[PDB]
Design a protein around this motif. Structure first.
Motif, PDB file in Angstrom:
ATOM      1  N   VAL A 141     -27.437  11.817  -9.731  1.00  0.00           N
ATOM      2  CA  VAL A 141     -26.384  10.939 -10.218  1.00  0.00           C
ATOM      3  C   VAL A 141     -26.779  10.295 -11.540  1.00  0.00           C
ATOM      4  O   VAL A 141     -27.756   9.553 -11.613  1.00  0.00           O
ATOM      5  CB  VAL A 141     -26.074   9.819  -9.211  1.00  0.00           C
ATOM      6  N   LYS A 142     -26.015  10.588 -12.586  1.00  0.00           N
ATOM      7  CA  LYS A 142     -26.281  10.015 -13.894  1.00  0.00           C
ATOM      8  C   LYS A 142     -25.312   8.886 -14.199  1.00  0.00           C
ATOM      9  O   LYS A 142     -24.096   9.052 -14.090  1.00  0.00           O
ATOM     10  CB  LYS A 142     -26.176  11.064 -15.003  1.00  0.00           C
ATOM     11  N   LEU A 143     -25.859   7.739 -14.584  1.00  0.00           N
ATOM     12  CA  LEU A 143     -25.042   6.601 -14.977  1.00  0.00           C
ATOM     13  C   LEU A 143     -25.393   6.141 -16.385  1.00  0.00           C
ATOM     14  O   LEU A 143     -26.563   5.968 -16.720  1.00  0.00           O
ATOM     15  CB  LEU A 143     -25.262   5.455 -13.987  1.00  0.00           C
ATOM     16  N   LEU A 144     -24.369   5.948 -17.206  1.00  0.00           N
ATOM     17  CA  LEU A 144     -24.542   5.319 -18.499  1.00  0.00           C
ATOM     18  C   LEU A 144     -24.329   3.812 -18.379  1.00  0.00           C
ATOM     19  O   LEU A 144     -23.374   3.361 -17.757  1.00  0.00           O
ATOM     20  CB  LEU A 144     -23.528   5.875 -19.489  1.00  0.00           C
ATOM     21  N   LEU A 145     -25.237   3.038 -18.958  1.00  0.00           N
ATOM     22  CA  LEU A 145     -25.067   1.592 -19.062  1.00  0.00           C
ATOM     23  C   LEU A 145     -24.592   1.235 -20.460  1.00  0.00           C
ATOM     24  O   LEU A 145     -25.389   1.189 -21.396  1.00  0.00           O
ATOM     25  CB  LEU A 145     -26.411   0.920 -18.819  1.00  0.00           C
ATOM     26  N   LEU A 146     -23.297   0.991 -20.610  1.00  0.00           N
ATOM     27  CA  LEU A 146     -22.745   0.605 -21.907  1.00  0.00           C
ATOM     28  C   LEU A 146     -22.467  -0.891 -21.960  1.00  0.00           C
ATOM     29  O   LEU A 146     -22.499  -1.577 -20.938  1.00  0.00           O
ATOM     30  CB  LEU A 146     -21.465   1.392 -22.187  1.00  0.00           C
ATOM     31  N   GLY A 147     -22.201  -1.401 -23.154  1.00  0.00           N
ATOM     32  CA  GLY A 147     -21.853  -2.809 -23.298  1.00  0.00           C
ATOM     33  C   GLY A 147     -22.494  -3.453 -24.503  1.00  0.00           C
ATOM     34  O   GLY A 147     -23.478  -2.950 -25.034  1.00  0.00           O
ATOM     35  N   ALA A 148     -21.929  -4.573 -24.935  1.00  0.00           N
ATOM     36  CA  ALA A 148     -22.452  -5.303 -26.076  1.00  0.00           C
ATOM     37  C   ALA A 148     -23.886  -5.693 -25.789  1.00  0.00           C
ATOM     38  O   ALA A 148     -24.333  -5.638 -24.642  1.00  0.00           O
ATOM     39  CB  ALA A 148     -21.623  -6.536 -26.312  1.00  0.00           C
ATOM     40  N   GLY A 149     -24.609  -6.074 -26.837  1.00  0.00           N
ATOM     41  CA  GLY A 149     -25.981  -6.529 -26.691  1.00  0.00           C
ATOM     42  C   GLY A 149     -25.999  -7.880 -26.012  1.00  0.00           C
ATOM     43  O   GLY A 149     -25.096  -8.690 -26.210  1.00  0.00           O
TER      44      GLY A 149
END
Ligand SMILES: Nc1nc2c(ncn2[C@@H]2O[C@H](COP(=O)(O)OP(=O)(O)O)[C@@H](O)[C@H]2O)c(=O)[nH]1
Length: 353
Positions: free
Chosen positions: A33-41
């Motif tokens: 299972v691959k998850l990307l963690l996106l979001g502002a700093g």
């Protein structure tokens, strides 16, 4: 009867065979299972990664725990420094005039001492400054300048952190901060599943598009700092920090990358928001907001505002959660739930024996 010999068939199969080609059957990893963690700093992406280690991996060792001391000092230094600079910026008075010369001596020390170190003379200066009523008046106004959300947490326990033979507690580690632009990764097992998690930084700067061509991504975890609604913009940019996070999230749903990927919204820092909301009206970020200024209704209002940015009609695909990344017990609940959604929506054929 003869294993190395053979006894089945009739002149259909001849020559050498490739069942060791069907070894790629074993290479079939749908339990990946691959998850990307996106979001502002500064939205809590790293903290989530840290939590993954604490909860599912072996927590930090004592050797690892001690490698944060140097960042934890820098973090504390950088924090007091930021307050001290804001004493003049916001033009706030020191509680005891004498504290003004400590703050001058600090600028001096900070520029000389070794990065990561916290000499006894410095921590004493810092410990007094913190007890000053001026600094405290300036601290409460942290929203009017750039201040680490962990500034308070550290400066409250500064003594506990400078006692020789100091060992960073799991919380301390969790509260540390190290800005990065590239990608942090982590791999851990949970529920007979191998998780590979990717923290993608530099979203307001570069906003790379190669991230899309990344194969096998089960879900996108997008973090938002709830407590950013309060931060006033000296930028004059069209949208403050909350609306900037929205513009980033808007291009995450707006982007029609067709690989089957659920997206999960982490409205993070619900703890800090719970403190802010009572003092600072949510009208600061949304003037049209008629609802009351309390944790439940305001938080929901924000969540809506984000969910409402959903461009592509994602058939049962937008999941969200109020989270406190530094809170292990909390993250354990949210990640249990996320896993439960992953394993159902992105299910390999069920074992059933
Ligand atoms: N109180 C509180 N602090 C948090 C939370 N999440 C992150 N932090 C702190 O906020 C700061 C920024 O987080 P960080 O993970 O470094 O942000 P990044 O820039 O996205 O990696 C750090 O000092 C963290 O310890 C949270 O949920 N609650």
């Amino acid at each position: 009867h003869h294993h190395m010999g053979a006894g089945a068939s009739a002149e259909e199969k001849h020559s050498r065979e490739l069942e060791k080609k069907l070894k790629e059957d074993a290479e079939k990893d749908a339990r990946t299972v691959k998850l990307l963690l996106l979001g502002a700093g500064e939205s809590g992406k790293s903290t989530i990664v840290k939590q993954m280690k604490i909860i599912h991996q072996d927590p930090y060792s004592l050797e690892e725990c001690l490698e944060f001391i140097a960042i934890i000092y820098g973090n504390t230094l950088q924090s007091i420094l930021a307050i001290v600079r804001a004493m003049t910026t916001l033009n706030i008075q020191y509680g005891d005039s004498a504290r003004q010369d400590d703050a001058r001596k600090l600028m001096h020390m900070a520029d000389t001492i070794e990065e990561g170190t916290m000499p006894k003379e410095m921590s004493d200066i810092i410990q007094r400054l913190w007890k000053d009523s001026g600094i405290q008046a300036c601290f409460d106004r942290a929203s009017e300048y750039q201040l680490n959300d962990s500034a308070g947490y550290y400066l409250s326990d500064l003594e506990r952190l400078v006692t020789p033979g100091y060992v960073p507690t799991e919380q301390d580690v969790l509260r540390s901060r190290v800005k990065t632009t590239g990608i942090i990764e982590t791999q851990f097992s949970f529920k007979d599943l191998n998780f590979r998690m990717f923290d993608v930084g530099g979203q307001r700067s570069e906003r790379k598009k190669w991230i899309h061509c990344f194969e096998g991504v089960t879900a996108i975890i997008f973090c938002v700092a709830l407590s950013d609604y309060d931060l006033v913009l000296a930028e004059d940019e069209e949208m403050n920090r909350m609306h900037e996070s929205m513009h980033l999230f808007n291009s995450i749903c707006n982007n029609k990358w067709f690989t089957d990927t659920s997206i999960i919204l982490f409205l993070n820092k619900k703890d800090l928001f719970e403190e802010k909301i009572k003092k600072s009206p949510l009208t600061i970020c949304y003037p049209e907001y008629a609802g009351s200024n309390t944790y439940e209704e305001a938080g929901n209002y924000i969540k809506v505002q984000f969910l409402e940015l959903n461009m592509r009609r994602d058939v049962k695909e937008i999941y969200s959660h109020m989270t406190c990344a530094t809170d292990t017990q909390n993250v354990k609940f949210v990640f249990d739930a996320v896993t439960d959604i992953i394993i159902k929506e992105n299910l390999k054929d069920c074992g059933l024996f």
